[PDB]
Design a protein around this ligand. Structure first.
Ligand SMILES: Cc1nc(COc2ccc(C[C@H](NC(=O)O[C@H]3CO[C@H]4OCC[C@H]43)[C@H](O)CN(CC(C)C)S(=O)(=O)c3ccc([C@H](C)O)cc3)cc2)cs1
Lengths: 99, 99
């Protein structure tokens, strides 16, 4: 679809069998999701933005469905205030910026 | 134009008569630039990011050119890791997300 930016570009996603709301975020290289106890192996990472860094757990090859568009790749899990879909997955669903 | 997301959506902006590079950031409500001199009055404000809250200088009704497209709006100046163009200005230039 077409998403205007009057409000936060929040959409419904499906990850690890759960539905959540997440931001389609062109300013994020990678995807960061709220704390969730996903199965499988992970590696610790620290990621930074405004206000400093948070610790996250990096899971590879995770399936996420975004408004019906399936994607698979790296997700970082930790205490983010918001679920963030970054460019690693936006590219996979064919998402572009247009003006 | 149509901007794909395989790379960071960096653009040249014009503000205060000076050219800078900035990130088109749909996950940002607000536009936040790195420490720079800007003319006019400003008020102290706080903003929160992934890592916590920072002190910024809020400049209202500032002229800013984004890839030629003119915007006049609020610009926050402070210790952001990256110059980000947020939705307050992306809406002005007619930016949408599409997939
Ligand atoms: C109840 C509460 N809500 C909050 C605020 O919650 C939010 C809401 C949205 C965001 C998204 C964030 N936007 C943002 O900082 O925007 C601020 C300016 O406008 C306001 O509007 C929202 C906040 C304010 C960017 O879009 C994306 N970022 C990078 C850019 C800075 C370069 S990143 O997230 O740092 C990040 C870093 C690394 C990676 C991987 C490793 O690549 C992925 C993402 C973050 C926190 C606090 S408390």
């Amino acid at each position: 679809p077409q998403i205007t930016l009057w409000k936060r570009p929040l959409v419904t996603i499906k990850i690890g069998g759960q539905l959540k709301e997440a931001l389609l975020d062109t300013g994020a290289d990678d995807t960061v999701l709220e704390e969730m106890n996903l199965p499988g192996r992970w590696k610790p990472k620290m990621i930074g933005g405004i206000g400093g860094f948070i610790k996250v757990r990096q899971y590879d090859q995770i399936l996420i469905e975004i408004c019906g568009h399936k994607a698979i790749g790296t997700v970082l899990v930790g205490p983010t205030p918001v679920n963030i879909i970054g460019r690693n997955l936006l590219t996979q669903i064919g998402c572009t910026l247009n003006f």
